[PDB]
């Protein structure tokens, strides 16, 4: 009963709402003040600081979506193994399915763990490039 899978699905939603959502917003404020002022005829090296951040934040949209696929990929692997695991002690071929559902699943987690580390990575920087907008 590793329904930490359901907990995780919930953390991903929160990460999306509290991390990614505020970041994307912060930067949207800047783009709209860039445009609202770029119309009154009034940005220089600032648009480099901002360019870089809305790319990290955009790489961070992508990355979360990449770990969210990876987990769907993994949830199929884990439920695959509980089907095979189950109908085996309903009694050599059944014994193999479990070994291979098992292999498919430790592999899915490996890919899942990877896509998380790479999401940890992307957001850590997006946080940073967006704080570096302490331009004067």
């Amino acid at each position: 009963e590793g329904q930490l899978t359901l907990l995780l699905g919930k953390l991903m939603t929160l990460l999306g709402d509290v991390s990614l959502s505020q970041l994307e917003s912060r930067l949207a404020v800047w783009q709209a003040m860039i445009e609202s002022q770029k119309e009154m005829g009034i940005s220089k090296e600032f648009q480099t600081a901002l360019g870089e951040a809305q790319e990290a934040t955009d790489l961070y949209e992508a990355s979360i979506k990449k770990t969210d696929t990876a987990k769907s990929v993994y949830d199929a692997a884990t439920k695959k193994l509980t089907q095979a695991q189950n109908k085996l002690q309903s009694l050599a071929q059944a014994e193999a399915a479990v070994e291979q559902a098992g292999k498919e699943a430790t592999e899915a987690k490996e890919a899942l763990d990877k896509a998380t580390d790479a999401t940890v990575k992307a957001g850590t920087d997006a946080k940073a490039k967006a704080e570096k907008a302490d331009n004067i």
Side-chain angles (χ1 to χ4, degrees):
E1 195 79 333
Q3 72 187 21
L4 299 156
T5 55
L6 176 62
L7 194 71
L8 178 59
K10 276 169 202 179
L11 185 58
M12 296 288 296
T13 294
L14 186 73
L15 196 43
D17 185 343
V18 184
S19 167
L20 179 59
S21 164
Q22 319 284 110
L23 264 166
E24 202 242 332
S25 162
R26 288 166 56 176
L27 303 191
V29 186
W30 290 133
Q31 193 50 255
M33 177 198 287
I34 263 197
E35 286 311 295
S36 92
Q37 280 211 35
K38 183 178 179 180
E39 279 171 9
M40 278 174 64
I42 303 301
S43 159
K44 183 186 183 180
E45 57 174 0
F46 172 73
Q47 169 91 83
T48 314
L50 187 75
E52 289 188 352
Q54 70 201 5
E55 285 215 9
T57 292
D58 280 342
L59 160 73
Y60 185 36
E61 270 145 40
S63 78
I64 282 184
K65 193 170 181 195
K66 261 178 230 165
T67 189
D68 156 77
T69 304
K71 173 177 79 90
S72 277
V73 151
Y74 160 92
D75 272 330
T78 205
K79 286 175 290 171
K80 188 202 219 183
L81 176 67
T82 305
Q83 298 311 308
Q85 187 190 330
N86 259 351
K87 283 134 238 179
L88 161 60
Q89 61 257 3
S90 173
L91 317 183
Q93 287 289 13
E95 201 210 5
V98 165
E99 303 172 1
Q100 203 199 337
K103 273 173 174 178
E104 294 295 26
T106 47
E107 300 180 313
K109 238 179 179 179
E110 201 50 50
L112 177 63
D113 213 288
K114 267 208 211 183
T116 303
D117 272 320
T119 286
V120 176
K121 245 174 234 308
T124 300
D125 179 64
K127 291 174 65 175
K129 292 200 191 311
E131 185 176 348
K132 261 188 297 171
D134 276 343
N135 291 21
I136 308 174

